[PDB]
Amino acid sequence: VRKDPITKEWTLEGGALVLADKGVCLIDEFDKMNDQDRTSIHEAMEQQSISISKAGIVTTLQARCSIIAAANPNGGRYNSTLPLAQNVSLTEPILSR
Amino acid sequence: MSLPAHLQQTFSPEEIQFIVENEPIKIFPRITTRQKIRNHTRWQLITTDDKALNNMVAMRSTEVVLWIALLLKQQSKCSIVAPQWLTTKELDRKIQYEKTHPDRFSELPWNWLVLARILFNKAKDDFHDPIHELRGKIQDLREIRQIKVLKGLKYLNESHLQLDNLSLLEINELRPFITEIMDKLREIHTASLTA
Amino acid sequence: EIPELVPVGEMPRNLTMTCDRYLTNKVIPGTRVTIVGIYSIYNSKNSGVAIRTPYIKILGIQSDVETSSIWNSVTMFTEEEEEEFLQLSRNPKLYEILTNSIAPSIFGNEDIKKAIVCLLMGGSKKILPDGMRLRGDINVLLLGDPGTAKSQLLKFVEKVSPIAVYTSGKGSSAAGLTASVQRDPMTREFYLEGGAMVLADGGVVCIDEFDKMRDEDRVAIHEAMEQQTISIAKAGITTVLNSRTSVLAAANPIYGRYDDLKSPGDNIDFQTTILSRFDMIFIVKDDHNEERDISIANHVINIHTGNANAMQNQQEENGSEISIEKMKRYITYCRLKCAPRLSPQAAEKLSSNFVTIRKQLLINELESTERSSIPITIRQLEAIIRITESLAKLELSPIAQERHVDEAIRLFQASTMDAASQDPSLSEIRRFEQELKRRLPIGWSTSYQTLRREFALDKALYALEKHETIQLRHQGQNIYRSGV
Amino acid sequence: KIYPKLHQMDMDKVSRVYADLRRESISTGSFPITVRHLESILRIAESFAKMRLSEFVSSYDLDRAIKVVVDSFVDAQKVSVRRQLRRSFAIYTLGH
Amino acid sequence: NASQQQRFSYNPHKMQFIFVGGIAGFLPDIEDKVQMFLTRYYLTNDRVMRNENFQNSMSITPIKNLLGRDAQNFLLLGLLNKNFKGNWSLEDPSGSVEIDISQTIPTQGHYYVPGCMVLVEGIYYSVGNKFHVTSMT
Amino acid sequence: MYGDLGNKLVLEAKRTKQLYARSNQDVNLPMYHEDIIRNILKEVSNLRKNTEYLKEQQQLGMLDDKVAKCQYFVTLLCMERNKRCLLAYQRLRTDILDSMAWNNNGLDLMDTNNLSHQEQEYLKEYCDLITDLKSGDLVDIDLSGSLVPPSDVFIDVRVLKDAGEIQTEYGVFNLIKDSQFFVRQSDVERLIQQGYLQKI
Amino acid sequence: MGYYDIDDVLADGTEFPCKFQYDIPGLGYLENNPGRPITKNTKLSLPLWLARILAIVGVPFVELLPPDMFSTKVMNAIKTDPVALDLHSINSHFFSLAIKWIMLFSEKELANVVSELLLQRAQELNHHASSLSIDLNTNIATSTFLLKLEEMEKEIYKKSHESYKDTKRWMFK
Amino acid sequence: TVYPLHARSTGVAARQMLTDFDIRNINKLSKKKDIFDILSQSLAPSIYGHDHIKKAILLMLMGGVEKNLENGSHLRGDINILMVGDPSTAKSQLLRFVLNTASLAIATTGRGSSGVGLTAAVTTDRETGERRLEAGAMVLADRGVVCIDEFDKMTDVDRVAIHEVMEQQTVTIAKAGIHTTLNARCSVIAAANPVFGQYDVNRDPHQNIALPDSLLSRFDLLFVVTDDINEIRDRSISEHVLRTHRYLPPGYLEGEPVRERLNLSLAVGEDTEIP
Numbered sequence A: 001v002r003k004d005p006i007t008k009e010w011t012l013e014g015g016a017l018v019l020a021d022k023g024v025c026l027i028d029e030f031d032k033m034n035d036q037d038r039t040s041i042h043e044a045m046e047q048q049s050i051s052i053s054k055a056g057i058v059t060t061l062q063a064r065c066s067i068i069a070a071a072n073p074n075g076g077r078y079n080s081t082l083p084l085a086q087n088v089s090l091t092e093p094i095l096s097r
Numbered sequence B: 001m002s003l004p005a006h007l008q009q010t011f012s013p014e015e016i017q018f019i020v021e022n023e024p025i026k027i028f029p030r031i032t033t034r035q036k037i038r039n040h041t042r043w044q045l046i047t048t049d050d051k052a053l054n055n056m057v058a059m060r061s062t063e064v065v066l067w068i069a070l071l072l073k074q075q076s077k078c079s080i081v082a083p084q085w086l087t088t089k090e091l092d093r094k095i096q097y098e099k100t101h102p103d104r105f106s107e108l109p110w111n112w113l114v115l116a117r118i119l120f121n122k123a124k125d126d127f128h129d130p131i132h133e134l135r136g137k138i139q140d141l142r143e144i145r146q147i148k149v150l151k152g153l154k155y156l157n158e159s160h161l162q163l164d165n166l167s168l169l170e171i172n173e174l175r176p177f178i179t180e181i182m183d184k185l186r187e188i189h190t191a192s193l194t195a
Numbered sequence C: 001e002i003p004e005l006v007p008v009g010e011m012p013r014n015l016t017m018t019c020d021r022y023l024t025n026k027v028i029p030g031t032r033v034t035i036v037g038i039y040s041i042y043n044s045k046n047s048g049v050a051i052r053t054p055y056i057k058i059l060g061i062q063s064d065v066e067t068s069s070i071w072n073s074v075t076m077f078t079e080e081e082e083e084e085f086l087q088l089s090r091n092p093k094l095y096e097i098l099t100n101s102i103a104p105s106i107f108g109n110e111d112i113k114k115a116i117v118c119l120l121m122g123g124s125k126k127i128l129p130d131g132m133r134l135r136g137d138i139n140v141l142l143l144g145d146p147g148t149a150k151s152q153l154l155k156f157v158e159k160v161s162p163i164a165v166y167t168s169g170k171g172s173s174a175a176g177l178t179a180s181v182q183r184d185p186m187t188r189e190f191y192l193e194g195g196a197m198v199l200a201d202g203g204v205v206c207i208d209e210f211d212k213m214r215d216e217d218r219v220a221i222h223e224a225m226e227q228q229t230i231s232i233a234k235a236g237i238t239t240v241l242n243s244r245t246s247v248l249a250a251a252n253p254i255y256g257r258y259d260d261l262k263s264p265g266d267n268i269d270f271q272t273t274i275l276s277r278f279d280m281i282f283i284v285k286d287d288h289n290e291e292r293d294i295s296i297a298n299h300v301i302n303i304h305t306g307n308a309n310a311m312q313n314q315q316e317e318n319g320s321e322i323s324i325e326k327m328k329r330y331i332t333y334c335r336l337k338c339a340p341r342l343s344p345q346a347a348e349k350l351s352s353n354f355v356t357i358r359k360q361l362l363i364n365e366l367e368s369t370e371r372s373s374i375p376i377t378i379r380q381l382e383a384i385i386r387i388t389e390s391l392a393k394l395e396l397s398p399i400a401q402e403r404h405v406d407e408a409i410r411l412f413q414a415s416t417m418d419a420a421s422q423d424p425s426l427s428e429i430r431r432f433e434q435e436l437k438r439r440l441p442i443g444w445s446t447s448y449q450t451l452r453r454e455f456a457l458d459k460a461l462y463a464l465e466k467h468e469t470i471q472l473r474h475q476g477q478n479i480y481r482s483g484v
Numbered sequence D: 001k002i003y004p005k006l007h008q009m010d011m012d013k014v015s016r017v018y019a020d021l022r023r024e025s026i027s028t029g030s031f032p033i034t035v036r037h038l039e040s041i042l043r044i045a046e047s048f049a050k051m052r053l054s055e056f057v058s059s060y061d062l063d064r065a066i067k068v069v070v071d072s073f074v075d076a077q078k079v080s081v082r083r084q085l086r087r088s089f090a091i092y093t094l095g096h
Numbered sequence E: 001n002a003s004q005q006q007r008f009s010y011n012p013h014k015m016q017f018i019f020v021g022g023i024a025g026f027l028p029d030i031e032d033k034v035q036m037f038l039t040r041y042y043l044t045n046d047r048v049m050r051n052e053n054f055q056n057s058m059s060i061t062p063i064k065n066l067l068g069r070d071a072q073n074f075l076l077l078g079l080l081n082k083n084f085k086g087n088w089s090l091e092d093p094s095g096s097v098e099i100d101i102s103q104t105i106p107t108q109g110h111y112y113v114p115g116c117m118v119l120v121e122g123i124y125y126s127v128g129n130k131f132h133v134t135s136m137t
Numbered sequence F: 001m002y003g004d005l006g007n008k009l010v011l012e013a014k015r016t017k018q019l020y021a022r023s024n025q026d027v028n029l030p031m032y033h034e035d036i037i038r039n040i041l042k043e044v045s046n047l048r049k050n051t052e053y054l055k056e057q058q059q060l061g062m063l064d065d066k067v068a069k070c071q072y073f074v075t076l077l078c079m080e081r082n083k084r085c086l087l088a089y090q091r092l093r094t095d096i097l098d099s100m101a102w103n104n105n106g107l108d109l110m111d112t113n114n115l116s117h118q119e120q121e122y123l124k125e126y127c128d129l130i131t132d133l134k135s136g137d138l139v140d141i142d143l144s145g146s147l148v149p150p151s152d153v154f155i156d157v158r159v160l161k162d163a164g165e166i167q168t169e170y171g172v173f174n175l176i177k178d179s180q181f182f183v184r185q186s187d188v189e190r191l192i193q194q195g196y197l198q199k200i
Numbered sequence G: 001m002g003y004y005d006i007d008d009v010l011a012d013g014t015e016f017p018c019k020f021q022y023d024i025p026g027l028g029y030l031e032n033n034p035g036r037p038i039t040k041n042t043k044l045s046l047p048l049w050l051a052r053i054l055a056i057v058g059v060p061f062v063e064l065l066p067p068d069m070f071s072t073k074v075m076n077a078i079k080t081d082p083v084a085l086d087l088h089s090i091n092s093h094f095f096s097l098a099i100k101w102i103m104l105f106s107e108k109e110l111a112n113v114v115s116e117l118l119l120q121r122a123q124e125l126n127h128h129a130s131s132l133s134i135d136l137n138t139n140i141a142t143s144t145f146l147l148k149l150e151e152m153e154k155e156i157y158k159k160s161h162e163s164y165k166d167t168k169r170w171m172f173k
Numbered sequence H: 001t002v003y004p005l006h007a008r009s010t011g012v013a014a015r016q017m018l019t020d021f022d023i024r025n026i027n028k029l030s031k032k033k034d035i036f037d038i039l040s041q042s043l044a045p046s047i048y049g050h051d052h053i054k055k056a057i058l059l060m061l062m063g064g065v066e067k068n069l070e071n072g073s074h075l076r077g078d079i080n081i082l083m084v085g086d087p088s089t090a091k092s093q094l095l096r097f098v099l100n101t102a103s104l105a106i107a108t109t110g111r112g113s114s115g116v117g118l119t120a121a122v123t124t125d126r127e128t129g130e131r132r133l134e135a136g137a138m139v140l141a142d143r144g145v146v147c148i149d150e151f152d153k154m155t156d157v158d159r160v161a162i163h164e165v166m167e168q169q170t171v172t173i174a175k176a177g178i179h180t181t182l183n184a185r186c187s188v189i190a191a192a193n194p195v196f197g198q199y200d201v202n203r204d205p206h207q208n209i210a211l212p213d214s215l216l217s218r219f220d221l222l223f224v225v226t227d228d229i230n231e232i233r234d235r236s237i238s239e240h241v242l243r244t245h246r247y248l249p250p251g252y253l254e255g256e257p258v259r260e261r262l263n264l265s266l267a268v269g270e271d272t273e274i275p
Ligand SMILES: Nc1ncnc2c1ncn2[C@@H]1O[C@H](COP(=O)(O)OP(=O)(O)OP(O)(O)=S)[C@@H](O)[C@H]1O
Pocket: A046, A047, A093, C105, C106, C107, C108, C144, C145, C146, C147, C148, C149, C150, C151, C152, C250, C251, C252, C296, C300, D035, D036, D039
């Protein structure tokens, strides 16, 4: 949401998952995003709808995206002797999507 | 108890229709029960006169009780003659009377609403006037008479009231309100006059 | 415009509209309406050439949630549908009908559906003579492993409830949840704009992804959940708004899965203060049971292969389910008609059960030597009271008998006591296991009084029962070595 | 312009595959197998049916989706248990 | 015969209801085992509510009501039994409580055995959650 | 005071009143409020014992006319008020029972556990009294018949519940389920009231 | 004023402000002191079925004070806008109690006000009872006025509305 | 006409008129040996326990005498109470009661209040068209009380203002070319939570409270409430709460929702003993 510089009221503008609605969203270096930035795609990747309730703007956008993300194992090399959960920093709620 | 709550001190509209159906009406028979000079079972009823029924001659107007006229009109064996007050000219005259005298009701028969409903439902093809106009004038009379009633229910004292020329169905529907508001305004008065 | 009708990658579009005379004060923000109007044109002087601002002049509004207030703060229910509701309330299986019709596509989760029914009906509000008021709304928290259909339940509750707001924990700020002070572009004067907890007033707000909220945003719900008022002192404004909303929040324990190896307090990052507001705190788990997995798979496949559109319709027409448009009306009618109050026999049961619950929590805390993450407080006694009153309310019973108390106690034991009962000295346990393994033979049994003489809480016997090496059979009076 | 339907299918095979996936996930595994991974099989089968522009998901388009899902699950396991898991799941990918 | 009588289950508030299919049609259900002792307790409780109060007028407090009370006197109607821990107790539909049978004066004109429903009287103690019975009959 | 239990009793009686009014669900009288009846009856016994205690204490003791008259008078008034509340509750229940008996003498003879023993005996004898009335002199007319006027002689009906075959006065009716008749309204009134035929 | 009339029974059981006149001994069973008597010149709230009798038998034992529901404030409210008065909150049985008060005290001025109030409110409740909803395929004013009727007017309205509904149902069948 | 109904009683002024009978009754009750206990226990009858907190609240309602000494010295006569304790110990219900009872009380919350909103906001007048000060939530409560719920949640930038007010009882404004000194002679009662979820008796009462000692020093009484799990006390509290929840208003039937109309405006304008 942003304060419109001309009309001076809060307005809602979409991001990557809205510009890619009914398309594909490509997230290179998935494991290097901040956790509090990576958790923001949990709803739009399963429910396929972005819910915003900021600055008095209560609305639920629609984002029918299809995330394709490229990750990188811990340490730079995939250790085949360890399970998957021990090779990545991602958790179950984001790995299950 | 024996008598249900909604039948305590009033008549259900079905009972009003029952009362109205006992009034004589004039019909044109489509059969002929008049025995010739040259068997057959006679009516011999106990709550009315069977004389006009054993002497029916086709297309010769007689008068029979309304609940029998309807019974014959269930088949094609009679033709109910609409009363003279149920014509467009007379309904217009009554409407003009109502619009001219805003203090008193017109002299319509006590069963005008019930009779109009019954004849419109069961004898819809026996009117010399278009029924779509008779309905529109019956409704107009009902509306004017409802306006006059609501402006007289503004005179609900505790002594009495004169609802002259009011019909039977209108009185029946106004009974539980008038007769229960006047009772309270009488109880208040008698409580005050306890000296 | 409807969120399901916006084109691809487009923001929803607004449209100025004008009511007049008897079509005014007919709708409230957030309600979905169908309008019959004249798409007209007016040239507001507020940036092209010969442009004209469009608007619709309303000639008829057909909401589906009643007028201002609920049914205009009274009952606008046609006589035939009121009689239908009365006939419905006398159904001996009304509780099962309501439970079976809450998200019919979600297999299992019977207890959560029952708690959702109680949340939708809500308790009975009280206003004491001395001034303080007691809230009558139920807050439910749904913790558990991912993939357990918590968000689907929240989305369904957002539909069935007459007034509901669906928000996600991530994309939601404190000033956007309760009330936002905004500056009028024309008059330069500050004013409030209601948030999610004001739009959902008189209904339920579903906060999905609860644990993702910023720590300074989740605090703003503390007053609006218990006191049910929003206090604002900003920019020269000083008001105490009203938010009589039930909060149905779905969260996620840290590490995604519950990870019962870790302590129960480690999985839940919510403070005790926030956890105390919630009346029922469900912790669901993935059982990984083959017989249940087959049932879930066969149900989901039937959902996908068009079989739902036939089976659900057949069940609804059979009378074992209620359509959304009918349950919504019934919920509104029950909330505006009945506010049950406890009978003295019910109150005695509630008190004697609260004492038991607190004693159990005390002994668990003493054994673990650490405060329980899930708290049991007087607010939970009021939670059981509200659940009892909602159970009575759905039957339109003016007084809550002991049946409702028994069911409310069962619901609380199935949700909050279950959440609080999760468990991860050791030398004593090892000594006990070794001595009973060597002394008690593999195929025989010994009575428990004898083991007590040998000696505590003796959780070692329960642990061994988990390992299937012993087995308590004769009503707990006989400990039998099962064969391990 | 294509929306394949899952009318003709053997739901028993998909249910058995899902049950086996969960059983091997809980024991000797770490990849989370929820109901989302059951719906993933159906979604991948529908995508495969879209590739042939078909309006109905065939048995081949379902067996291929099952193979894709079980392969992605197996290849993410530790090398110690991968052979056993592949042997256990071989009975569902019969034909390829 | 025992297999041809009328099923009479007592509705707990006030009612004595009547209840009245194959090879294994005689097999009882689990709820029958659950309610086997509950029905017996309800019958005994009705008998007490008809006789004792009209003859002797202390009330019968359900065992669940003894928790917060510290030293008050109560009259309990419960099923005497032995706990799994090996100490005597009374079982009630509302709960159970251990009883200190020492220093008890029983009515000598009765047989007291585990499983028989008794009318104990004593002072509850919350220090160890025990009911110090004084006279049981 | 002393009528609070009676006040609650008559409040519940009002609820039963409007309750049964509600159109015609022919609702069953809410189970007798035995518990409230017992308390107020016990409340009456305490008041009567207080009068007995005061009267004997007045005789042996030196009590002036003032208190001896006034305490007795107030206790008598409280007892009268409790009697009135009990009487109003019982009379409403009796009126509803009479309505049910009159309407269901042609419908059914029925949960009966909602009635006390006295009320059950009252209803059981009242049915016999009604049958005595329907047989003494007014036997020609069906005194238990419908009170709606007989508008139309011939009606058409649809069979709701299958009843095999039922003999009428002259012929016979084959009550096949979901089969429509066209018969005189006279000979099917009892079946329509009972709940086997539906239309009009 | 029937004996078995539940409306009258409930109307009787309403507390009324009344001061005492005698230092009466031994009373007050449930008046905050069972054994301890009631002092003279004590103001107490008593049910009408008790205060009515105690204010006539004897100087009478109990003197009845003007209740708030008939105070000059309520009288002015009645005389100002009879239709828009929330008489259900003032007293759910206002009219029965007013009739009883007039009967007790022969108040020729309270009666002259309550009768006009009843007439003016009867006009409006007839207007609301005779207006029947018609489906093209309840009004806000009707539902917001029906909340301001005592238990007496709520019965007159029910009876008249049922009569109008029956007449409409019969005519248009 | 302007008729100042106030005190949340919906029809009477904040300065309630005192009849001679009322003053006589007040003087009669002032002679009781335990008038303090009666008045304190009568404050919030629905809140079981917390007798000492009720006594402190009553003492705060009639604050001490204020000394306007010479040489500019000013000894405040208002009592400030801070309540920090475990969740659900009626910390906020007591604040709500003080709101509903005190003649002039202003409700405030930690999250929903900024320093500008607590002291003064420089807005612009619309009738005249000029800069003006608007009294904040804690200047409006001058000679009253301020009920700051969730005290510890206040941001540090928004906490310096209340520190200044409790220090010298006047706010100062130095923005938009305005140099005034508004008077805020209010007595603050605040409810706070421990740093962790619940109070920890194993730590000193400094790391349990998330407020600076320079701010806790301005509170006359710092009451620490603990939700200790007992058995007798739990039974007493449960019985009391269940008695409270069974309360039925006079003019209402059982199982009937408590609708509110507040149309008590039948008229506009003025129209020994041991209990
Ligand atoms: N018991 C069930 N019955 C039917 N569908 C189910 C069931 N459990 C899971 N699902 C499906 O599995 C998916 C679960 O996704 P969501 O419920 O939106 O996410 P979630 O369950 O809330 O888990 P989170 O939000 O990541 S912690 C949906 O497609 C559900 O339809």
